[model samples]
Target: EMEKEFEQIDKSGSWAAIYQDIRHEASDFPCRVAKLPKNKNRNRYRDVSPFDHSRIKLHQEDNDYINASLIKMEEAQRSYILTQGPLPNTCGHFWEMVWEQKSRGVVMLNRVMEKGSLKCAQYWPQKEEKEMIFEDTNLKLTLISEDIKSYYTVRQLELENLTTQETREILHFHYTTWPDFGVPESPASFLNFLFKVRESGSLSPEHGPVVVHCSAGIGRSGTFCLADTCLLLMDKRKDPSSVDIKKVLLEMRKFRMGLIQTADQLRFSYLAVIEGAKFIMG
Candidate 1:
């Protein structure tokens, strides 16, 4: 029924109509913290901002702000911290949030550069560098291992708190392709990559919310969360047709404003979930 709705939206300017209709799906949510003068430069784009209500707070210091949101999917028993790619100066704040949140994994949905533009600041330590120290946050990140794959790469990282001498192993999952127009190499490839994250146990209920990000932290990040949550919901409900993805997307928007940014992305997310449902239901 929903899949038919997509084509129906196209049947009768139809995509334009559908995209506009999808735009109306979200209510105007206030973004107070992100609008603060002190926090203005911390944001990546003027159009996107994290809602204060569900934002990830770094309260260690009196003055600190990171444009990130902790999206809690209660029914799915999962959580994700969606944020923009770290800016040059905010990389320390980025890792600080990861440290403070005790997040075991990070999903980088975009690359350092895309289409000849710098989409994200190089926030992680390279294997060649071996280590990068963030003096501001009193943190050190060391590249432990990296396994290269066709569409993605998994890197093992050791994060240490220089102050307390405590350390944690973090798995950084980097998906190489950018969903520029809401299309990846393929939905199947993305789903396979999602399963790889699942197999790592990084997304389990017990761990802190998995950090998910793209350049804007709305479209592709939101798509991954939507697809993964929907598949898990199908697993629990025992029926693929029972999941209402639009409702799920609307609810997710409550945690962070402007998720699944375009109608094209909205459509791709649906197909990804529908494709993933087969694996869950088969």
Candidate 2:
């Protein structure tokens, strides 16, 4: 079923229409929180706003807004905190929230600088500084270890809450291979990295949600979550063809806006799920 659905791309069919319809869906909801004047600067993009209803509320202390959303997949029993790459000022809050939820790891889909522009801030310690402290948030992060690979690297970070003087081991999985536009050419490599994250058990349902972000935290982040969830859904149902890719995208979009940004990303997501299904069923 999925193979033929992909075949419709070369010919004129309803598949093309499906994308245009999704582009307009769930976008009319009010972004009352993200639009507030005070919270404006915390957002990386002017237009990529998180919907208020599903927006993850940071600790309430007169400052309670962050460009983050809690995405829960009921059927798959998985949850992810999807948010934009941290702005300079918001980096503290980003770590704080990850600590708040006791997230075991962070799944970053973009780089500090993509091509020409700065896609994301260097939120964690990157060689020059072994450790960094967030004055406002009273949090300290020290680079503990690095397991580098060709396409991606997994770094172990020590997050310390100065207030409590407690630290936790947080895994930072950076996918250096994802392109600025389009999708990764290697679904095989992508799956390898996805399995790497899974090997840590951070993305598991039993643990706290793993924070997911890309440049916008919408396109690439959304694609990763959708593919991960669908791959598992196929396993549980014992039927790969039963998983409906289109409907699942809409469901996730309800929590955060503009997931699966491009039709290419959407196609890549379908490709990953099928490829993953192959690895599983065999």
Candidate 3:
């Protein structure tokens, strides 16, 4: 089924057509919340916006707006808080939301600096660094362990609530090879990173939603979620050909805007999902 769909997508150049259709369908929905007076310039780019209906609301705070969305897949029983990389001003709020949401892990898809510009805030402690305290948010993060891979890095973070003196461990998974608005060099490496994250058991519902972010939080982040979800669906169904990739993508976009941003990203998603299904079935 998937192969036939891919073959058709190849023949008619439907990938571009599908991408255009998605943009046209999504344009009718209001993303104006990102432009509201209280929410001005929080996003790094004007083009990136969060849908109001599914946007994560900060509790008990007046200036609670953040460029993040709660994307959930009921069948898979998994949830992801898709969010942008923390801006300089929003770093404190980012940690605050992570603490409040009780996220057990954070999946970062971009580096701090990319192409001579800041892509994401240095939100975590560096190597040989003990702890960094967010004074505004009253939180402190202590690095417990760090494992550096060729294409990815994993860190065990200890998030401490200063007021209560309570601490919780949060895993940080960083994929280093993905370029801005581009797919990874190969699907094998990307699947390896995905399985590494799965082995940590952070993406499970037993924990709070895993926070996944890239620069804008829609391109690479969306691809990651889509691929993971489709593979999970295939695993659950016990059939490699059972999962419909297009349907999954459409379902996901209802929760967050502009997911799987480019046709290249979409094509890569299908490749990763196919690769991942083999891994799971075996």
Candidate 4:
């Protein structure tokens, strides 16, 4: 399915359009997923899908050593995790949102790697894909694919027209996605991937929260973030029965709405946790 999707790419035009579908996608928030109203335009939804919460925490107070608070949404302040899209055309309105979300305090780092070394292919959202790219060069970020023809990194060559003339302090890190076919529907593979990403992101104070996205920022990104949160929530409690993912996911969707929309995505998410618990605790 992933390959077929890639094959359909024009392989020309603005790399952003090819990679992200600039026309459709708007923002670079993994926290966003579509929740459809029961009717075509109904405000009321029959079901709330999974959603990514604000990566920005309200404060260090929520960061429990046992179950470190990785994602906080309901807090008064709103810190966000994003890579591109819906650029703050206004004078830093985007950053303002980030500041509001940060209760423990706010920290912004450029985790979004764009053009040059990074190769982006039309993944899902092309327009937002335009906004999501790492401008920093000092970092060791690279988009590695088994084959380069099918997937090439898509990043803005010029970051808000700021990449020019400015000296950038780049943070070094490497990240990539698995073949859509190799998404590892297995519980073990999913757990391993999440564990690896969490450890990698947490190890670097400069790394910040891992910004994730795919299509509508639901299935892939939501799965990744929620899985990470479930681990954190469970670890915070020594009690075996303390963490209930269904309850947690329910609370999560209340804020973002329609996060884990597709039944397949939802099923993958649920099993990922079930398998993750066995792997982590065992």
TM-score of each: 0.94, 0.95, 0.93, 0.44
Name the 10 consecutive residues with the lowest summed lDDT in model 4: 102-111
Per-residue C-alpha lDDT of model 1 across residues 205-230, encoded as one tens digit per residue: 77888899988999889889999998
lDDT of 4 by residue, 105-164 (tens): 121111233333222223212343233432222111122212211112222121221324
lDDT of 2 by residue, 1-282 (tens): 575777676366455467778887655577888988998889988889888888888775888899999888899998999999999889999998988888999998888888888988889997636689988888999898888898889999999999999999999998888866667886887888889999999997667889999888989888789988988888888666888878888888888888988777777888888788888887
Alpha carbon deviation, residue 102, candidate 1 (Å): 1.1
Q: Quick one: best TM-score, which candidate?
A: 2
Q: Give candidate 2's error at residue 252 in angstroms.
A: 0.2
Query: How well is each residue in 227-282 modelled by candidate 3, as lDDT tens digits?
Result: 89988888788655878887887788888878878998888888888777777776
Tell me how far candidate 1 lies from the true structure as C-alpha RMSD in angstroms. Answer: 1.8
Q: Count the backbone clashes (under 3 Å) in each candidate.
A: 0, 0, 0, 41
- Over the full model, what C-alpha lDDT does candidate 2 score relative to the true structure? 0.85
Return model 2's CA RMSD, one decimal: 1.7
Regions more than 4 Å wrong, model 4: 1-184, 202-207
Q: Output the number of the lDDT-best candidate.
A: 2
* Candidate 4: C-alpha RMSD after superposition: 14.9
